[PDB]
Amino acid sequence: EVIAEHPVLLNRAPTLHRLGIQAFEPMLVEGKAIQLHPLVCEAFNADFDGDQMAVHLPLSAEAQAEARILMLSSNNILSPASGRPLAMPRLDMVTGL
Amino acid sequence: KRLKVVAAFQQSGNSPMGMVLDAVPVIPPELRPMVQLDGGRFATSDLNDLYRRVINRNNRLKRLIDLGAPEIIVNNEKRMLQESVDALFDNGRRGRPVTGPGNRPLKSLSDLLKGKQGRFRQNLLGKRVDYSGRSVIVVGPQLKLH
Amino acid sequence: TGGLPRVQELFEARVPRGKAPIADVTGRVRLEDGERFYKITIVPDDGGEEVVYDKISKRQRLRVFKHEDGSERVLSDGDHVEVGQQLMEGSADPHEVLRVQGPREVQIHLVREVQEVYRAQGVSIHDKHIEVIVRQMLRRVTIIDSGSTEFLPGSLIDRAEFEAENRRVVAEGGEPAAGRPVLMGITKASLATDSWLSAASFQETTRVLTDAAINCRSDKLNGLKENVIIGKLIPAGTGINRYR
Amino acid sequence: NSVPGAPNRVSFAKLREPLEVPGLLDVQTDSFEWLIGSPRWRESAAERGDVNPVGGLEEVLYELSPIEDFSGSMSLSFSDPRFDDVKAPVDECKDKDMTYAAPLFVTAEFINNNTGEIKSQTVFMGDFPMMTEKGTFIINGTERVVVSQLVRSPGVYFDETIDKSTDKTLHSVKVIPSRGAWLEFDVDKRDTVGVRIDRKRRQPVTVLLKALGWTSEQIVERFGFSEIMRSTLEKDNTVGTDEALLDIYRKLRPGEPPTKESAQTLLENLFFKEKRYDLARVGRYKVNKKLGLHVGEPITSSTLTEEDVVATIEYLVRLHEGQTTMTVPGGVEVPVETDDIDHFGNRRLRTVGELIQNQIRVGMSRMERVVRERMTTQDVEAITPQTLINIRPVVAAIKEFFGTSQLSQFMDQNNPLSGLTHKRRLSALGPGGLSRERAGLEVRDVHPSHYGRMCPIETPEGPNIGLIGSLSVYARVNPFGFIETPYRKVVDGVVSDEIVYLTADEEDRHVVAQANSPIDADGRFVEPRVLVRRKAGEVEYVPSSEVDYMDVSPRQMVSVATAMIPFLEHDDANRALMGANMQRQAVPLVRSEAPLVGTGMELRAAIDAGDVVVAEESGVIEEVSADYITVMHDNGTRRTYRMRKFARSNHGTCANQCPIVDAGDRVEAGQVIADGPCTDDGEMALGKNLLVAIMPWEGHNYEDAIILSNRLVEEDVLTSIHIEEHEIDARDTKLGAEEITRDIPNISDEVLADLDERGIVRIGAEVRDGDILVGKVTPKGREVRDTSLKVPHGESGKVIGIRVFSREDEDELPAGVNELVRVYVAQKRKISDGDKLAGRHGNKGVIGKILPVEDMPFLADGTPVDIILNTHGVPRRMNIGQILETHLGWCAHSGWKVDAAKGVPDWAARLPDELLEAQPNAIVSTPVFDGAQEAELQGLLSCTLPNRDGDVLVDADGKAMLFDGRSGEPFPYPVTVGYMYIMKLHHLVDDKIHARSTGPYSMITQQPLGGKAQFGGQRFGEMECWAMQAYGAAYTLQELLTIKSDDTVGRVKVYEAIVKGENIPEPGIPESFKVLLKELQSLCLNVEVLSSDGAAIELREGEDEDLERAAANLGINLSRN
Amino acid sequence: EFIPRPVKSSFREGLTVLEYFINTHGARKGLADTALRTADSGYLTRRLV
Amino acid sequence: LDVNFFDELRIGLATAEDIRQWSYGEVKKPETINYRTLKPEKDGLFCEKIFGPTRDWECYCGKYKRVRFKGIICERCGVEVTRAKVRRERMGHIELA
DNA sequence: CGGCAGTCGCCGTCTACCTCTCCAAGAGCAGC
RNA sequence: CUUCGGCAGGAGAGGUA
DNA sequence: GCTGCTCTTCTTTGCCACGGCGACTGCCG
C-alpha cells in the first residue's frame, strides 16, 4: 500500500534517443529479476540474454507529475524522428497474426 | 594577430603585470587529503609533494641569498625554482615530467580540469544518485503497457 | 562506415578531397585539351576577366549533366554554361557555392548532400531535423572595413550585433560597416559562444580559460549547460516563466 | 585408444591419424627447463643436433662477466649456478601465504693482475620462484600464470610506399636492433639516398661510406651501376673521411666539443661496440640470411659489421632499380623482395623463460654498476668477493616482475577448461608490444600464415579482439622462438610416414596438399589433380607430380576449446567464436554426467589439465575410502594418494575429487583413479542432457528467453556449491592492543549464542546477514569499543571451516599483527529465474519461467519435455548444428539397428562396423571436420528401436506429436524433439541485484560512492541528461542533480520531510561547483559570483541550527542498540 | 577486394577446411567495428548536441 | 544563499594583492603530519593555525573543548575555536624570494 | 627584400556495469 | 535532556550487454 | 658502537597511431 500508484523510471544504456527512459507503475513479484513488457523492447533495444537496467524513484510532487504525465510509457508510441509507430507487434506476434 | 592581444589588454582596466608572479596560493587541505594504507604507510597525494619541492627550493634560495653567495649559484637556484613552479602548475609542458614511485608522472593542478576524467566532464555534467538500483530483466507477457 | 566520413566532412564544412570546380560566369566554354590538364578557361558572355581553371589531372571524369539543349551529354569545346555548375565530377565546395550562388543555394546543397547518405541505407529522417543544424551553421559575418564600429577587420561577429552597431553608427554618423556572409563548422562555432563556462566544458579547457582570463569575460548564465552546472531550472519545458 | 582405461565411445570418422596429439603443457614447462638447465633439457637437446648446450642463467652470467675497472688491474667473474631444495611444499605455501621458491648460489672469483692472489667463494643471490608440476607459480599464496608475448623480430625490413602527387614508388630500409639505436636509409622525391640516423637529420649516404673508409675510387667502381648512386655521389660535397666524420659528429649533437678523439669514439661506440648495440642471435641469424652474408659458420659476436651496412644500401638500390635478384661478393643468390611485418616468419614468441631472463639480466646490469664503483673506494688486500656484490637489485627486480606486472596474471579457475586455456595463450600486448588504441586494423586480422599455428576462431570480442589468441593443437616452438607445425612428406606421388616440422618461411616455398585427399591404400593419390596451398595463400589445382607435403590431419588448424564443438562446419564464425568462449564460463555441477554426442577431445583435455588423479605405476589396489586410495605396486612398495574435498577455487567455485575404483581392481600406469570438478569417468563434462522441444510457447520464450521444467529443481539437476572466505586481524593500537573475546560491551545475550569460548562461530551454524563472526574490541579515545566481523549484506550460508594463526604460537605473521582468523561459508544454489544458460553452438538466454510438470507438453506415452526453445532465432543466426546435434542425440539415446538382411543399404556403405547396431543410452563421437554426413543422419533417423511398448514416437523427419498440458487438445502439427547438451554459466541473478536509499559518501566531492561492494549509487551520465532535457522535465532533473547527489544541507531535510510526512523543501547549492571555484582560484584565476548590482556574493556556508532532532543515521552508517 | 575463389557449399552440407578458413576474414570485420568505430558516431553526436 | 539570485560569473587575472587578500597565513615548512602523534605540524601544509581546527570546538593545546568558548583565539597555540568544516574553504600562500 | 614550403607541435578519438591484486628504499644521524 | 568515542585514494589485469 | 628515526630523489642507459590545423623559420630566389 505504500508502493501503490507511485511511478518509477527505467533506463538502459546506451541512451541513444529520448525514449531510452520511460516511467511505469510498479508491481511486486517473487524473484530477483525485473519483468518488462514485450512491446517496449523496441525503444529500449533490449533482448533477454543477459541485459540489465537501472531503476530510479521520483520523490517530490512535481517530479511525480512529470513522470506520470510527460514520461509515461503509454503516451509515447510514435517515433519523434519520423512519426512511425514503435510499440507495435513484431517477431512472434507478426507470425501469429 | 598582435592587436588581438594589445587591444584586449588596453580596453579593460587590467594590467599586463599578471603573468609574472610574486606569491603562490595553496589549496585547502581537505581537497588534497592523505589516505592510510593497511594502517601502515601513507599512499601519497600527488599534489602535496609539488608544494614540498616549491617550499624546499624557496628556503634554499632564501638562505643562499641571505648569506651572500656568488651570482652563479643564485642564478642556478632561481632556474631550479622556476622549473619547480612550472611543474606545479602544468607538469610535462616543457621538458621531462616530474616522476614519482614506479616511474609515473605526477598529477598537476591543470590536470584536475581537462579530459574525459576531469572535473568538468565527470563531476559536473554527470553524477551518482541515491534511491537507485539495478538487476536483470526478463519478459512478462501478462502486464499492460504501463 | 563509408557513409559516416562524408557526413562528418559536410558538417565540419571541410574542403572536399576530390573537389570539383564550379562555373563562375556564363558563356562559351573553352576546353584547351591537354594531357594531365583539361583546362577550361570560359571567357564571359558580355565581357570581363577569365577564370584559369587548371590543375585537374585525369583522375576524375566529367559531368554527364543534361546538356544545354534538353538532352544529356558530356563536356567538350563549345558549350554554354550557367552560373553554378559542376565542371568536373565529384564533390563541390560549399564555400565556393556560398560565395557564388548564395545562402539559399548553399542550404539546398547541404541538406540534399546530407540526406542522400542516410537515405541510401534505408533511414528516413524528416528534413526539419537538419534545417536547425544548417541554420546554426551560418549565423556570422566577416568585417572588411571598420571605421567607427571598432570591429577588428577580418573578425567574425554575429549578424544581430552587426546590424545593431551599423544602425547605431549610421545615426549621428556616416560610416556603416561592410560585411560578408561566412560558413562555420560545428566545432569552431561551438567554441565561439558567448559564455566561457560552456566552451570550457566542451573542449580545450586551458586555451579557453586563458583567453577568457586575458579578455576579462563575463557569463550571463542563460543556457542549458550553465543552469545544469550551477543548479537552476533549465529555461525549457516546465521551467520557463509562463508555466512556472 | 592409447589410454589404459578409457570408456568406449564409437566414432564416425573415416580417416586415420598418423600422429598423436602432443603434451598440451609442454610450451610452459620446456622453457622453464631450458632456463633452469635441467638434466631433462640437456637430454632433449642432445638427442637433436646441437653444437653446445648452454642454459638460460649461465648465458646471462657469461655475457656479464668479466667486470673490470678503468685501470685494468682487477676483475670479477661468475660461473656455475646451483639450486638448493624447496623450502616448503605447495600445500603449505598456499595455506600460510608464502612464495614457493628455492635458493640460488653462484661462485665468483676475484682477479688481482698485479700480485696474483686468487679469491673464490660461493655467494647467495636470493630465492628464485619455481614452477610447479602444472605450469603455474604460487606468489604470496595465489596461483599465477605467465603468458607468452607476440613480438616483432629484430632484423632488416625493406618496405615500399605510395604517393599523393608525382606517383613515384619510394623505398626504405630499417635495421631494427634489440638494444640500440635505429638506422633508416630511404629514397625520396629526387634521387637522394638519405640516412635519418638516430631518428634525426637527413644526410646523404655517400658521406657515410666515405667516412667509414670507402675511397672515392672504390665507391664509384662498385656503387656505380645506377644513376641514383652516381648522382648522389656527384652532389655529395663531401671529400675526406675527416670532413665527413666531423660533419656527422657536429650534426648529431649541435654545439658540442669537436674533438676528433670523441668523434671516432662516438662512431665506434654507436653501431660497432659491444655494450651499446646488441643484435641478438635471432636478429643476427635473420640478418645473415636475408642479404646472404656469412652462412653456417657459428653466430659468434653480435655487432653490426660494415659489410652488412654496405649490403643494405646495395640491396636498396637494386630493389629500386627493379632487378629482382642480386648476389654480394661472398654469399648465395637471394631474392630481392619486400617484407610483410605481420608474417609469422617475422614474429617470434617470448616464452616464460625469456621473460624472466630479461628481468634477471636487468637486475644483474644494475648490480654491475655498484660492483664497478666499489673498486675505487675500498683498499687492495681488503677487497673480497663477498664485499663487492649487492644482491638487493636482483631480488627487487624479481619481486617486481612476479607481482604487479602485465604478463603474470591471476589464474582463471572456473573449471579445468578455463585453466588449461589460460596457458597456451599468446598475447600481443605488454612492455614492448602494441597498445589498445595505437593498434590499427591490420594486426587484428587473420593472416594466411596463421594456418596450423594460431586458431582463427578463439579470440575475445571486446576491445581486445585480434590482440589475444590461442596456440593450435599440433604446434610447437623453435629454439629461436618461431612456431612450427608438422607435415607429412609425399615423394614421387606416394605419401610417406616421415613427419617434418616446418616454419612459415620454409612452408611458403613448397606446395602443401590437403588432409582429405583420396589415398589408394598404398600411398598413391587416386585423382591426378589435387588441391594445394601455394606461396601467397592462393589455392590452385596441380597434378600429383610436384606435391611434396601433406597435412597430418584435419582439425590441425583449430585450438583445444574449438575442437570440442560437434558439427563445427555447419556454424558461422561468430556463433562458433561465442560458443568456444562460453564453454569456459560453465560452473562445476554436483553430478556432471558426460555428453551423449561429443567429439574425441574430452578425454585428453582432462588428463592434461591436471584436475584428475592418475596412477603412476601399475599395481593392485589395497583399500579405498572417500579420503585416500592405497595402491600396492608389483615390487612391494606402497603409495597412497590424498583427495581434496570441498576446496575453494580462485573464482569461488568448489573443487572435489571422488575415487572411481574398487577394492580389488588392477590399475595400470596412466589409468585415471579419481575424478575431478567437471569430470565423469575421466572425460570432461560441463553440462547435462535435456529433452528439447523447438516451438513458440505463449510468449514466455520471446527474444531468447527460455522455459524450464520443475523437475530440474526437484531433482537438483542444475545445482552448484559456492564457497566464500572472510578474514579479520588484530593489530596493535597506540592506546593499547586489540583482542578477540566474547566480551562485547553491553549487548543482548541472544546474539552471542553461536560463539565458542575463544570468540569464534561454531562449525555447522547457519549465518544470515548481520551476524557476528569474530568478536573484536579496540581501545577507544577499560577503553573498549566494538569492531566485529559481521556477514556482508545479502550473504548467507553454513560455516564450514576456521583457521587461526597466532603470533605466540610460532607463526610468521606480518608486522604489528597478533592474530589472523579466516572463516569459510558454503551455500547450495539452485536454478531460478534470471540465471544464464547456454549450449555449445552459440545459444544463450535467460530463464524466463519455471513451469510445473503437469502443464508442460508431453509425448504420447506421457513424458514431459525439459526445456522449450524458440524457432525464430535459429535461421537468421546461421547456427544449424544444434538441430543436427538434437537429431543425433535422439538417435543415440533411443538406440538403433539398421536392417541388413539383404545386403547393406547404399547410405550405410561408408559406415564402419560396430555402428550398424547400438543399445539405448549409447555414446558416440563426431570429430570436428570428419563426422556424420546428413545422409547417414537421415538414414539412422528411420531405423530406431521402440520404447518399453511397441511404439515409435519420432517419425523419419525427427518430429513428434505433442499434447497440451493446460487444455488437453493435441497440437495440430508435429514438433521437432530430441536431446541437447546444456551448460550453466557463471552469470547468476543472485550476484547482480542491488538497491540503495542512502549510504556512504565520498570525501572531496560529497556524491555517493560507486560499486556494489559498498552501497553505491548509479551514475546519471551526460546522455541521460540529454534525454531528460528533450523530454522537458526540469524539476526531475533539478531534484536528481542537487538533492539526491550534492546538496549536503538538503539531504537531511528531505529525509526528515519524508519521514514526518510534510512537503519536500527547496534545493540549495551543490558542492562540486564550490570545489571547482576553489581550484580555479588556486590556478591564479580571479573568479567571483556577482549580483544584480555588483557586490560579489561571499558564498560562505551560513550559521545553521543543524541540530539533529531525529538521531537516526540518515544512512552513512547502520544502527546499534 | 573479392577472392576469385568462391565457396560452392552451403551451411547445410558443410564447408570444407580451406573454405572455412577463408571465411573467417569477414567475421573479424563486423566484430571489430562495434568496438572501434562507435567512437566516430558518438563524437559526432556529442558535437551535434 | 539562494541560487536564484546569482546574476553573473566573472573571470580575470589575479595579482599579488588579491592572492594575499584571499589567504589566512603563509606556509614556510615542507612538513605535513607527524608520524607518531598523527597531528599536523606547525606552519606546515596542514597547520591548524592558518587552515583551521581539526576537531569541532577544539584547540591545539586543550584549554578550550566546549561549544560556549567559540570565536576566541587561544593565547598559546593561536588557533580559532570554530567548526571543523572550515578546513575546506581556507587558503594559504607562499612568498617567493 | 620577399615570398615560401616543409615541418613540428598540440588537439581529438561511445555509454553503463562486475571480479581480482599491489602501492620506496637506501643511507646518514641520533641519544644513550 | 545521553558524556566521550567510532570511515571511503591511485595503478594494472580479466569479463558482461 | 646500538638499532630506531628521518630525510631525500640528474650520465648513461632508456627511448618507441593517425588526421587536422596553424605557427614558424631557415632558406632560396
Ligand SMILES: Nc1nc2c(ncn2[C@@H]2O[C@H](COP(=O)(O)CP(=O)(O)OP(=O)(O)O)[C@@H](O)[C@H]2O)c(=O)[nH]1
Ligand atoms: N555503446 C556500445 N554498445 C554495445 C557494445 N557491445 C554491445 N552493445 C550493445 O549490445 C547490443 C548488441 O545486440 P545485437 O548484436 O543482438 C543486435 P540485434 O538483436 O538487432 O541482431 P540479432 O543478434 O541478429 O538478433 C548493441 O546494440 C548494443 O546495445 C559496445 O561495445 N558499445
Ligand SMILES: [Mg+2]
Ligand atoms: Mg537482439
Ligand SMILES: [Mg+2]
Ligand atoms: Mg542482448
Ligand SMILES: [Zn+2]
Ligand atoms: Zn591552544
